[PDB]
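Model the whole thing, not chain by chain.
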Amino acid sequence: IVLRGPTLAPTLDRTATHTVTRPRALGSFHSTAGPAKHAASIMAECKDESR
Amino acid sequence: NTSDMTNPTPAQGQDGARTLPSKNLVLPLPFFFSRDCGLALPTVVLPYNEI
């Protein structure tokens, strides 16, 4: 009778189970900030020519 | 590009009545895993995701 290496099929594991899909990592590179500021304009209360 | 597709063919009534042959063509897909043997997708290690 014919003799040969028996064929064994691996089993177990898990394929396409409980898809998560969360690989994103937040963060990027762009400009830092802007150094801008302003004062409260200029007030003027003067009349009568007090020298 | 085998001079069978790029050769102009005149109308049927003209001297050149040759028709363009229909032969299947194959195009390799250049990907990062196909760039080198050392790089390959671990399909067994990534069952959760779909490719």
